[PDB]
Write a protein that binds this DNA or RNA. Structure first.
Ligand code: GH3
Ligand code: GH3
Ligand code: MG
Ligand code: MG
Length: 862
DNA sequence: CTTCCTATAGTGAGTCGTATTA
DNA sequence: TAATACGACTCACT
């Protein structure tokens, strides 16, 4: 390991020496400096900005040590937070916070004082340790190198995109150790809060508020950034200038993996990376000794995927985002969102002010979301304008306990349209014909044209030619590209399809082409049992037409809608003539007879029968569809004036769900049956056992354990947290008692462990198929670039073909020699359950559909 | 039971009883 | 001595 081997005096030397060694030197320094950028503000970097962080940063810095006095002078006990806040350079303590705080804020969802603090406290610890190493490394990567100019130049402009090396030369000094927080979540809270606390005193940046008090279930405290700053983030460009996510790209090939920790970043002065983001220590420790070469090589290749900033897009990106009315509504405007003032009168509770409590909160619920999506945008935009030039930039990868592959950089190619459109590769090659074709294809996919045969897609392109004959020239005028489902990503194409015609099929192209199936997981299910209609629905079959699984269930459910629209039942009795009004909720259970008549009045298309579908891969039944169909289509409908027919909503919601669950239950029959099967295994395999009365017991609730195709092990270990609260006199005002979970539990939550065993095993696959994919595709068709998004594996226009094919070749080959369902069993037959065994088997019946029919499946790429 | 994972996480004022320090 | 900062416990919560 790193430590125990050499004294910290040099642990910060090896990384730099080795770095400067390959690649270059100029780029070597900027690297660890960059990595450092996620801990403390550059003394020089700062003096260079001569606008926003500039103001907040110092005010905070001061307050930090300034607070250390107030505490040092006082007698009595000292605020715990302090106890470990002192031995830490304040110039960092402040910086972390701002960012880390601004970071969390970018989450329109969880902004609860819990999260932030977690996020802050973590970093602080991430600096508490690696203290000197984080510093001494600087004094080191500061001094020049050992002579040499030529080879020290950095790359000699040699356009060859330097490739990383191997564990060989890799000095044992560059590894990883305990990448898990050593502090107790309890204390980690004291720190952040206190940080936050002092961030408030110093800078008013963000304020804390009591969200929906007295609400025993939805009661919590969150921090909402102050307007001032918010306002100077939509207008004042580069506002977050010096602000950079605690994780940024790299302008050099990343440090290859070979262990549970020790990858992505080089700088041994920071926090190590976890190959598998495990919600625990032990879980990750299991992954130590695995002997799973296929897993590593896979990620190693993905990580070594060089990226370039789409200089053209950016050019317009940061431009329009500052327009009062941007052609992209997906962009949080800069204008202020008013609201319907008090409804004429004042003291009334009919349906006006009664519903006003929910007719006015929309703005109080949206002003919070906008600021989110905006703070986010400004982030991706800074990094862009930041690396805009950088020759090449890599993204480090990680994977959840399930396998799925995530990029570590917050500015990952796995983000929104803006973000993706602003990315591209570099090792491109003269697209040629094969590519040009798919290029025009990718244009359509993005153009929202994914419901038709390729021939009709390409057609779509040639048809809208002149539509681009000016879009790529003066987009600032050609507001057409900003209409397609993904304008940004589309534009990127508009800029290629334009030049490809200015240079010919010789026109090199680095733009990655995206390939996404019809409905992942559901595709894999129909693959491990061969659901005849299943694959045919998830387009997995060599169909001649685009089978919209979502749309089939529409007409399908629509069919049953006409049924109950003729007979069904009838408006059941109210709830009047009774004893003493025991239950007056809904004085009419209505009937399926009039229900269909309401739906047929709304339309019911693929829309409604959408979410409820995919979600099925996560565990969505008729119970769940109620809420979905409601808030997704019913609830909002009426909250817009329409939906004037839905007299009793909740009921109608129970109606469609009903219809829905049916329509699919018989379609993707394999999926459900499979899940129910899985969902059945866990239970009697998760819940402990006892004995013939008395009380004695034997088998202890074993943690889910099985192995993926490529070899990636995995455990569910869905333990049950043991929470508690703290007492914190926040800002000498009140007492903030945080309810937090203790990262030292041991108990396990069966229930969940159950409802999750199935839906997880899914991704585990469609996330494992992927690895094998890229690997095979690497050695098979010598591929290097991969713009994969869990199920959207992409590559250069020329590597399209090999990819488009390779995916199948794996999906098949894999679910062929391998038997997920079966294998899983063998993974516990004896290891897990002992006696009984029975009243649980009932293997799922297989279907007749040779997987080779996939190698030719035109659609359903994934 | 009732929508996976990029992890999470009911709140604050009363009232006390302890180590801990200037 | 006498002043801190807080875990522990317990209610009522629009
Ligand atoms: N694992 C996972 N991936 C998701 C989920 N939602 C979307 N994705 C994938 O990540 C991609 C981008 O996700 P986000 O950046 O989180 O959402 P978004 O698509 O930008 O939505 P919006 O434009 O309205 O901001 C799109 C898709 O490939 C999700 O819940 N889980
Ligand atoms: N794990 C997970 N993945 C999601 C979730 N929502 C979306 N995704 C992933 O991101 C993908 C985005 O799909 P959409 O573009 O929203 O729909 P679609 O099914 O592709 O069909 P279409 O574009 O024609 O409407 C689908 C899926 O693989 C989610 O809640 N959880
Ligand atoms: Mg979203
Ligand atoms: Mg998809």
């Amino acid at each position: 390991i790193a430590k125990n081997d050499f004294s910290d005096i040099e642990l910060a030397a090896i990384p730099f020496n080795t770095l400067a060694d390959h690649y270059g030197e100029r780029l070597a320094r900027e690297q660890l400096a960059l990595e450092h950028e996620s801990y403390e503000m550059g003394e020089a970097r700062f003096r260079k900005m001569f606008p926003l962080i500039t103001t907040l940063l110092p005010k905070m810095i001061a307050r930090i040590n300034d607070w250390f006095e107030e505490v040092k002078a006082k007698r009595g006990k000292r605020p715990t937070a302090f106890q470990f806040l002192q031995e830490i350079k304040p110039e960092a303590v402040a910086y972390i916070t701002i960012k880390t705080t601004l970071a969390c804020l970018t989450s329109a969802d969880n902004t609860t004082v819990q999260a932030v603090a977690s996020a802050i406290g973590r970093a602080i610890e991430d600096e508490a340790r690696f203290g000197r190493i984080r510093d001494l490394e600087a004094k080191h990567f500061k001094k020049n190198v050992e002579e040499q100019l030529n080879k020290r130049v950095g790359h000699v402009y040699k356009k060859a995109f330097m490739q990383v090396v191997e564990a060989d030369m890799l000095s044992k000094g560059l590894l990883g150790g305990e990448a898990w927080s050593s502090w107790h979540k309890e204390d980690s809270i004291h720190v952040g809060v206190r940080c936050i606390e002092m961030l408030i005193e110093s800078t008013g940046m963000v304020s804390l508020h009591r969200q929906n008090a007295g609400v025993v279930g939805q009661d919590s405290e969150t921090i909402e950034l102050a307007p001032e700053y918010a306002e100077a983030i939509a207008t004042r460009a580069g506002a977050l200038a010096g602000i950079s996510p605690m994780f940024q790209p790299c302008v050099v090939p990343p440090k290859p993996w070979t262990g549970i920790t020790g990858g992505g970043y080089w700088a041994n002065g920071r926090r190590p990376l976890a190959l598998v983001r495990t919600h625990s220590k032990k879980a990750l420790m299991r992954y130590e000794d695995v002997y799973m070469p296929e897993v590593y090589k896979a990620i190693n290749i993905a990580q070594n995927t060089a990226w370039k900033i789409n200089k053209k897009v950016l050019a317009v990106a940061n431009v329009i985002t500052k327009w009062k009315h941007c052609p992209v509504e997906d962009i949080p405007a800069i204008e202020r969102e008013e609201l319907p003032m008090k409804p004429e009168d004042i003291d009334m509770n009919p349906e006006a002010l009664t519903a006003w409590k929910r007719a006015a909160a929309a703005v109080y619920r949206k002003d919070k979301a906008r600021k989110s999506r905006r703070i986010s945008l400004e982030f991706m935009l800074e990094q862009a304008n930041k690396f805009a030039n950088h020759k090449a930039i890599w993204f480090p990868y990680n994977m959840d306990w399930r396998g799925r592959v995530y990029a570590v950089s917050m500015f990952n190619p796995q983000g929104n349209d803006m973000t993706k459109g602003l990315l591209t590769l570099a090792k491109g090659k003269p697209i040629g014909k094969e590519g040009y074709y798919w290029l025009k294809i990718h244009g359509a996919n993005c153009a929202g044209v994914d419901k038709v045969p390729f021939p009709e897609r390409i057609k779509f392109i040639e048809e809208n030619h002149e539509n681009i004959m000016a879009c790529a020239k003066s987009p600032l005028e050609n507001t057409w590209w900003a209409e397609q489902d993904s304008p940004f990503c589309f534009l990127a194409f508009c800029f290629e399809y334009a030049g490809v015609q200015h240079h010919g099929l010789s026109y090199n192209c680095s733009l990655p082409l995206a390939f996404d199936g019809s409905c992942s997981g559901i595709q894999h299910f129909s693959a491990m049992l061969r659901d005849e209609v299943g694959g045919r629905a998830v387009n997995l079959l060599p169909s001649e037409t685009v089978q919209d699984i979502y749309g089939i269930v529409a007409k399908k459910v629509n069919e049953i809608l006409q049924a109950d629209a003729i007979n069904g039942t009838d408006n059941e009795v109210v709830t009047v003539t009774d004893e003493n009004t025991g239950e007056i909720s809904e004085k009419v259970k209505l009937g399926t007879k009039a229900l269909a008549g309401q739906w047929l009045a709304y339309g019911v298309t693929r829309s409604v029968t959408k979410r409820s579908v995919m979600t099925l891969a996560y565990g969505s039944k008729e119970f769940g569809f109620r809420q979905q169909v409601l808030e997704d289509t019913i609830q909002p409908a009426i909250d817009s004036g329409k939906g004037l027919m839905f007299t009793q909503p909740n009921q109608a919601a129970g109606y469609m769900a009903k219809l829905i669950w049916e329509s699919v239950s018989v379609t993707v029959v394999a999926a459900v049956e499979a899940m129910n099967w899985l969902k059945s295994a866990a239970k009697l395999l998760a819940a402990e056992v006892k004995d013939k009365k008395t009380g004695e017991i034997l088998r202890k609730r074993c943690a889910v354990h099985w192995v993926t195709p490529d070899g990636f092990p995995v455990w569910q270990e869905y333990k049950k947290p043991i929470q508690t609260r703290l007492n914190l006199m926040f800002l000498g005002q009140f007492r903030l008692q945080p309810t937090i979970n203790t990262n030292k539990d041991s108990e396990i939550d069966a229930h969940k462990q159950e409802s999750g065993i199935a839906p997880n095993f899914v991704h585990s696959q469609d996330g494992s198929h992927l690895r094998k994919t890229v690997v095979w595709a690497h050695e098979k068709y010598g591929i290097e670039s991969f713009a994969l998004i869990h199920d959207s594996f992409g590559t250069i226009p020329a590597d399209a073909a090999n990819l488009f094919k390779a995916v199948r070749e794996t999906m098949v080959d894999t679910y062929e020699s391998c038997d997920v369902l079966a294998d899983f069993y063998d993974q516990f037959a004896d290891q897990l359950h002992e006696s009984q065994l029975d009243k649980m088997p009932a293997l799922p019946a297989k279907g007749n559909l040779n997987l080779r029919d996939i190698l030719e499946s035109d659609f359903a790429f994934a």
